[PDB]
């Protein structure tokens, strides 16, 4: 049972920072430059070395301010986020991985989430005995690859709106609550125990989007398309799905506290009561920070809390086989311990999980996806991400197979490798060439 230190642990370089801390808070010390504030950082994180490319990241967000934002930054901001961090209590956060068909929960007001967010905004959680950290060191470094350094400022931009929004909190707001849920779902099934309880299932409803993306449907289970290692690169490199998700809701970075074993087969992660607070554009390379308006979708973004499920998909190489026994009641385990989770959120909104960084066959990972949604009696809302093409495809697909047996279909499925159609046709092309040819 691992218990991830929080900057009291140490008590000899707590009570450094606290100093530092308080001085930065009450204005007794008052940053007149960047350069202030990066010896700052370098005091705070026990650095007595350091070059001008440590924080390169930060000076290069700093600098997009303008006059005032940044006389605001220097003098507000660093002074209420260190306020923040003084607020913060507890010593170390527990990493508990629960016994079979149990439950670790991890639940925090929405303002303690913003005094973590504030120690990785100053760079001081870090466990000096495992030599790991889990702040934004890494973010501010500037690297040898400049769309990397625009990554690594662009989640910095998101992370920066949501801690003053944060700052801002009412009463109201800051005493909300937000639940971290690491579930363990029991006995995996396997592939012949999969085919025998399909028997009593039939396929369900499916709506499909080419436009809209996972979080743009409130009140539905939102999938993260997680890594094992809950977070992904967030603290890094990574910008695709689950990496975004973190810069736009950044509350979910606390689940790297409690979270530090990667999750097991057989395990799935529940985030409850997130809101978002960035918007944006892009994807990738292209990633960018947009400000949230006013307008009612957005404002009702800002607002109205949703609820997360992280679930991490097989990494496949290329020559994989993902088509197998053993592959395929892997992922219907995974996906509908996931999906049978919250079960009054009817509806799960979803994707193409493990279909980009991860190397998944779309059309196969859709039919596990639907299998599981259909098992757990749930409609699921899928999105194409512009494909269209593929949209088409799957709207014919599940207008031939709708209502009708999942172990059927199942088998049908598991079918196509071997099949006279595997070499000019694809597994959605075969279902639907043999879904017309039953008519
Ligand atoms: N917000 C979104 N909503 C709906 N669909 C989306 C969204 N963002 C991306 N997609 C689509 O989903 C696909 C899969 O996204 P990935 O992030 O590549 O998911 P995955 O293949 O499961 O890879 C998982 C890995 O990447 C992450 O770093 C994560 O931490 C994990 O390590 C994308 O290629 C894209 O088509």
Request: aromatic content about 12%; glycine content about 4%; some cysteine.
């Amino acid at each position: 049972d691992y218990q991830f230190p929080l900057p009291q642990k140490n008590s000899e370089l707590w009570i450094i920072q606290k100093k530092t801390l308080q001085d930065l808070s009450s204005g007794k010390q008052k940053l007149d430059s960047f350069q202030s504030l990066e010896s700052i950082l370098e005091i705070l994180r026990d650095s007595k070395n350091q070059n001008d490319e440590k924080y390169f990241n930060l000076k290069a967000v700093f600098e997009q301010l303008d006059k005032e934002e940044q006389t605001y930054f220097l003098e507000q901001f660093i002074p209420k986020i260190c306020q923040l961090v003084l607020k913060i209590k507890k010593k170390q956060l527990k990493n508990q991985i629960p016994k079979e068909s149990k439950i670790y929960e991890a639940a925090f007001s929405r303002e303690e989430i913003s005094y973590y967010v504030s120690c990785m905004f100053l760079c001081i959680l870090k466990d000096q005995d495992r030599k790991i950290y889990k702040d934004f060191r890494l973010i501010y470094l500037k690297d040898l690859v400049q769309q990397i350094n625009i990554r690594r400022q662009e989640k910095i931009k998101c992370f920066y709106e949501y801690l003053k929004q944060a700052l801002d909190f009412s009463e109201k707001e800051s005493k909300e609550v937000v639940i971290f849920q690491r579930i363990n779902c029991g006995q995996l099934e396997d592939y012949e125990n999969w085919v025998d309880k399909l028997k009593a299932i039939k396929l369900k409803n499916v709506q499909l989007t080419d436009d809209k993306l996972i979080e743009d449907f409130p009140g539905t289970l939102q999938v993260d398309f997680a890594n094992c290692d809950i977070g992904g690169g967030i603290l890094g490199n990574g910008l695709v799905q689950e990496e975004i998700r973190f810069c736009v809701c950044p509350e979910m970075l606390v689940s790297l506290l409690v979270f530090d074993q990667s999750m097991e087969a057989n395990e799935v992660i529940i985030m409850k009561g997130i809101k978002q607070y960035s918007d944006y554009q892009g994807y990738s390379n292209s990633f960018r920070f947009v400000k949230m308006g006013n307008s009612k979708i957005q404002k009702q973004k800002r607002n109205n809390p949703q609820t997360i499920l992280a679930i991490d998909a097989l990494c496949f190489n290329s020559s994989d086989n993902q088509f197998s026994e053993v592959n395929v009641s892997r992922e219907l385990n995974k996906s509908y311990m996931g999906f049978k989770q919250e079960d009054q959120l009817k509806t799960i909104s979803t994707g193409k999980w493990g279909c980009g960084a991860f190397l998944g066959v779309f059309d196969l990972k859709f039919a596990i996806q639907w299998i599981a949604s259909s098992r757990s009696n749930k409609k699921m809302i899928i999105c194409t991400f512009q494909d269209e093409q593929t949209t088409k495809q799957i709207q014919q697909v599940f207008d031939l197979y709708k209502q009708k047996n999942a172990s059927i279909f199942l088998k049908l499925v598991m079918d196509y490798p071997n099949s006279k159609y595997m070499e000019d046709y694809t597994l959605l092309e075969y279902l639907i060439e043999l879904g017309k040819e039953k008519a």
